[PDB]
């Protein structure tokens, strides 16, 4: 039957929709549904950029949801496969019916927020479109009636599966392309449709209702699904309402989480490009609306250094083509693809500023792309909002890269807790050098698990995973990276520190000698006694392409296309290294790879300050005739100053600075 509730949300005197209000207030409530999706079908009052509906094609992933919905319920989950060579989905099917709460054995709290934004249900509308089997709208019908029924609206705000917002605000950015995929099709009926809109003004009531209380990534997206629903869907009585709403909190969060450095507050490049992709998105609807007026004159001004950042954490492998990653994992992020960036990221950064030569350069260049416009310069990039130091010797595949994690906690990342984005890993740095990343960070693997098993998300997050200093390998408790000095010249210099522990801080000098290789000037300060430990995790490779110098407490390379490392610690106290298996996960689906790491350890006593010195050196073929050395030639610590001196290669450089 019409849900006679769609005559209450929608503005029956919107223009066009004058047969709607004739045939329903003659009580002809079937008439006027019908003519509201004769209207729907017809109109051309809207633009969503977002959607193209000419020369649709699917992909055989999607293909592969489209069908697996169809039987035994197994309906794609990202990151969540009964069986992921065939890309299978578990099957929530339980007695012959749906159970929406259905979660695999070892999931995180990620499967169920997943399979609440249907994932499927795009995949089945594009392959309703290529094929035109109406057994894909059919499915979709069958399947989100089940759903309305099933998960009704808490009155009291969101719950943590099927009302969370992120949830929420992804079902109303698909479901007003659903609507436009599947409106012609004979199973699309006016009783249909007035329990779909009554549905989707639910989904933007509540986004109204409730503004995400912790700010961040999902209020973000929450204003953006608001913009879209008011934007979109106008005839709604409540769609002003809801634009309005969302084009505000977005002019106010374009300001309030994006750093002077250019860097969203999370910390995290996924989110960070994707707080970018809601705000370019908002704009370009609005434009496309004739709603820009919605927005401030400069709304796009702070995505600029945001989409700077984006530029500095593209490595240069991202030039030429391959299936391997392609940008560091620090923090809750993970790998990305050639095509993501190009396509998607660089192409709305160019986009957004035509006259940038440098993203130009990044979206043309990429993935062996023909290159126009140009790169920056190859001076040392800091980010001292977020924590984050970029040195370079260039842009081009043949180059190095360093970047080097120093990261501060603020109001939308105040926690380093399990449950947050980030992680307790200061110092900490990833190395790409001439095609290889040598030092790739260890990644996320898997989120966090209410009331559950936490082991994986613990171990990715351990301080000793990453490439730093810690004591007894304990997690530090505070993230207050502080800048201390930088130097410009053949030789680069960063310093900086972060007071991680009560009784220990923990300053890094990073020399970047000649600009070919480094020299890390580590010291653990203050009175903390106990066993102190400088961590690497080391580029995969089989037994024989990494091998630990335990003898020499470091590590070198072997690879058999010369693009080798040799690495080694120095320090001033006896020390011991200690090699361990490290991990690596790619995405966020519970899997990884192992890969070498190790400790340099040594005791200090509580009048004592550790101080160690590493040289990491490419080396271009054999390893075996590189010789390094190193001391301290100053008195001990000092809090102004660090002198060292390294032998490489029968060339003796002293290294010195004074803050």
């Given at each position: ?14 223009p ?39 020369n ?163 209020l ?25 709403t ?108 035509p ?13 062996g ?6 790169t ?8 001292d ?53 040598f030092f ?18 613990y ?8 490439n ?71 580029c995969?490779?089989?037994?024989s ?71 990491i050196?490419p ?41």
């Amino acid at each position: 039957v019409v849900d006679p509730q769609v005559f209450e949300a929608i503005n029956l005197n919107y223009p066009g929709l004058e047969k709607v209000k004739e045939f329903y207030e003659a009580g002809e409530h079937y008439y006027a549904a019908n003519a509201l999706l004769e209207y729907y079908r017809t109109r051309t009052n809207v633009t969503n950029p977002n959607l193209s509906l000419i020369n649709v094609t699917i992909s055989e992933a999607e293909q592969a949801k489209a069908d697996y919905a169809l039987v035994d319920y197994r309906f794609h989950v990202n990151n969540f496969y009964e069986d992921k060579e065939t890309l299978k989905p578990y099957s929530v099917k339980q007695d012959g019916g749906i159970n929406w709460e259905y979660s695999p054995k070892d999931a995180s709290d990620e499967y169920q927020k997943q399979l609440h934004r249907h994932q499927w249900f795009i995949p089945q509308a594009k392959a309703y479109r290529v094929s035109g089997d109406e057994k894909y709208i059919q499915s979709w019908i069958e399947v989100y009636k089940n759903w309305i029924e099933n998960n009704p609206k808490p009155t009291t705000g969101p719950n943590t599966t099927s009302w969370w917002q992120l949830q929420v605000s992804t079902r109303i950015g698909d479901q007003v392309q659903l609507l436009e995929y599947f409106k012609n099709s004979v199973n699309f009926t006016p009783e249909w449709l007035s329990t779909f809109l009554v549905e989707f003004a639910e989904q933007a009531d509540f986004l109204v209702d409730y503004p995400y209380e912790s700010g961040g990534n999902i209020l973000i997206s929450q204003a953006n699904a608001l913009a879209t629903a008011g934007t979109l869907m106008p005839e709604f009585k409540n769609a002003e309402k809801w634009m309005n709403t969302g084009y505000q909190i977005l002019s106010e969060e374009v300001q309030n989480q994006i750093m002077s450095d250019g860097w969203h507050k999370e910390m995290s490049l996924h989110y960070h490009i994707g707080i970018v992709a809601d705000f370019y998105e908002a704009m370009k609807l609005a434009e496309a609306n004739q709603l820009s007026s919605k927005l401030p004159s400069d709304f796009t001004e702070p995505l600029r250094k945001a989409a700077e950042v984006v530029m500095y954490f593209t490595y240069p492998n991202y030039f030429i083509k391959g299936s391997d990653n392609v940008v560091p994992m620090f923090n809750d992020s993970w790998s990305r693809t050639r095509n993501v960036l190009k396509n998607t990221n660089f192409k709305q950064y160019v986009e957004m500023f035509p006259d940038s030569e440098e993203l130009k350069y990044m979206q043309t260049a990429g993935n062996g792309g023909t290159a126009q416009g140009r790169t920056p310069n190859n001076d040392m990039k800091l980010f001292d909002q977020a924590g984050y130091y970029v040195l370079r010797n260039g842009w081009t595949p043949a180059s190095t890269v360093m970047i080097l994690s120093n990261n501060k906690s603020n109001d939308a990342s105040n926690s380093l807790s399990a449950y947050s984005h980030n992680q307790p890993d200061n110092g900490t740095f990833e190395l790409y050098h001439n095609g290889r990343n040598f030092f790739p960070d260890s990644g996320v693997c898997t989120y966090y698990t209410s009331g559950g098993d936490n082991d994986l998300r613990y171990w990715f997050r351990g301080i000793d995973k990453h490439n730093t200093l810690s004591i007894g390998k304990q997690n530090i408790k505070k993230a207050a990276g502080k800048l201390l000095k930088s130097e410009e010249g053949a030789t680069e210099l960063v310093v900086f520190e972060n007071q991680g522990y009560d009784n220990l801080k923990h300053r890094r000098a990073v020399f970047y000698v000649n600009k070919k290789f480094f020299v890390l000037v580590d010291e653990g300060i203050g009175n903390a006694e106990g066993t102190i430990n400088l961590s690497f995790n080391l580029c995969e490779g089989t037994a024989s392409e990494v091998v630990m110098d335990t003898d020499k407490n470091g590590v070198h390379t072997a690879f058999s296309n010369n693009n080798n490392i040799i690495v080694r610690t120095f320090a001033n106290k006896a020390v011991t290294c200690s090699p361990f298996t490290g991990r690596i996960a790619y995405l966020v689906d519970g899997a990884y790879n192992t890969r070498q790491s190790y400790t340099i350890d040594m005791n200090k006593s509580a009048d004592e300050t550790a101080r160690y010195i590493t040289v990491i050196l490419p080396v271009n073929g054999s390893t075996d005739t590189s010789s390094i050395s190193a001391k301290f030639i100053d008195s001990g610590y000092s809090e102004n100053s660090a002198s060292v001196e390294v032998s490489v290669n029968g060339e003796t450089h002293t290294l010195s600075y004074t803050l």
